[PDB]
Design a protein around this nucleic acid. Structure first.
Ligand SMILES: O=c1ccn([C@@H]2O[C@H](COP(=O)(O)OP(=O)(O)O)[C@@H](O)[C@H]2O)c(=O)[nH]1
Ligand SMILES: [Mg+2]
Length: 351
DNA sequence: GATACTAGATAG
DNA sequence: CTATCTGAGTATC
């Protein structure tokens, strides 16, 4: 059994970028199941073999991490063109890891074709004809299908909590008690404003010491519909392998998602947050049935509620400690099922 | 005359 | 929101 994993639109090198981190992690946890896997990317590296030096068809399984098809500057993007060309040569089933509802697989030829540099490529190089199997992070396959409604070789869908991988790594450990410097914290990107309203609500104009790490920038929040005066402290991005330690700097860490993450997705940050020394607080709308934890104290409806809950968490260590003890318990139960998870994942890639 | 990393705006 | 169009701003071996 020879397994190849690749990121469709992002180069893979180390933990600098997130897409690069997800691919290496996915690479690791799969190797940890006792499988021989390679990461194919743009060049040879510590963790990667080059697309130009490997016969894609020497792999019994081709796993592909989801990405958009973004020709920045209206210019050719080597990351996307090289992986698709690679996928295009494969003749066996392709397993697409759909972890971001906004990153459904789609052919790039239709796009390249109508570009002024179409003459640089051809349909025979870019068109991916192999049958594709979508492995949705969301249990609601109906939505998964709809996101891939326009692609015909996508003929198989299956739910599987891909993003539980962090808590199932071999070296995984919950964070230790940490000296606090913040009341609330949140890590991530602007995600094209799909959460601008939620970010402003829970992180802007609160009076608390809030920090928003990640690639998001203060100047990106300019929608008059969601005005602000006092913004949280914007610090840049940090390696993915450190996120949970970063959250641990605050009393609490916010959980918010897009419109279609609500009661459908249980994202990675949920585990990264739940794993930290930061009391996890979820936006009510994100999980309206409280499926994550059967304890209303972990849920906030608005700014005022978040502000009340954070203040009551500082006002009392018995409460903060209790809530950190509970969430850690919920996580540790899910970790008890590692084998079960590993099993459904193999069966997910037909093993 | 740097290189790498990172969707945004708009009609239907 | 969804389908389709249009094309660079920011951080740094
Ligand atoms: O500086 C940062 C900020 C975020 N992340 C990762 O990015 C994820 C969040 O991605 P996104 O902003 O797309 O939000 P999501 O859709 O996952 O809720 C986090 O869970 C981390 O894994 C990271 O590695 N470094
Ligand atoms: Mg994700």
């Amino acid at each position: 059994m020879k397994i190849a994993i690749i990121n469709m639109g992002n180069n893979v090198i180390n933990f600098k970028t997130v897409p690069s981190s997800e691919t290496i992690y996915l690479f690791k946890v799969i190797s940890e199941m006792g499988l021989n896997v390679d990461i194919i990317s743009l060049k040879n590296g510590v963790y990667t073999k080059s697309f130009d030096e490997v016969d894609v068809n020497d792999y019994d399984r081709l796993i592909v991490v989801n990405s958009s098809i973004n020709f920045f500057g209206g210019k050719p993007n080597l990351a996307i063109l090289s992986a698709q060309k690679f996928m295009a040569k494969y003749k066996s089933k392709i397993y697409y890891l759909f972890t971001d509802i906004r990153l459904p697989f789609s052919q790039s030829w239709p796009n390249v074709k109508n570009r002024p540099w179409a003459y640089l490529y051809t349909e025979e190089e870019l068109l991916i004809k192999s049958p594709i199997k979508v492995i949705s992070q969301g249990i609601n396959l109906d939505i998964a299908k709809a996101a891939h409604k326009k692609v015909d070789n996508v003929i198989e869908f299956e739910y599987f909590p891909i993003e539980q991988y962090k808590i199932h790594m071999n070296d995984f450990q919950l964070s230790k008690p940490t000296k606090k410097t913040l009341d609330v914290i949140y890590g991530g990107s602007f995600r094209s404003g799909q959460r601008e309203s939620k970010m402003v609500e829970f992180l802007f104009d609160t009076g608390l010491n809030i920090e928003f790490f990640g690639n998001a920038r203060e100047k990106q929040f300019k929608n008059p519909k969601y005005p602000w005066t006092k913004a949280p402290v914007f610090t840049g991005k940090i390696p993915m392998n450190m996120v949970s330690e970063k959250n641990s700097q605050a009393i609490a860490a916010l959980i918010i998602g897009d419109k279609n993450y609500n009661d459908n997705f249980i994202t990675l940050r949920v585990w990264e947050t739940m794993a930290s020394d930061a009391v996890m607080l979820i936006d009510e709308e994100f999980d309206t049935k409280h499926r994550i934890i059967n304890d209303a104290r972990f849920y906030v409806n608005n700014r005022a509620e978040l502000i009340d809950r954070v203040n009551e968490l500082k006002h009392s260590d018995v409460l903060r400690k209790e809530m950190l003890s509970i969430q850690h318990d919920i996580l540790n139960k899910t970790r008890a099922k590692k084998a079960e998870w590993q099993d459904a994942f193999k069966k997910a890639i037909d093993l």
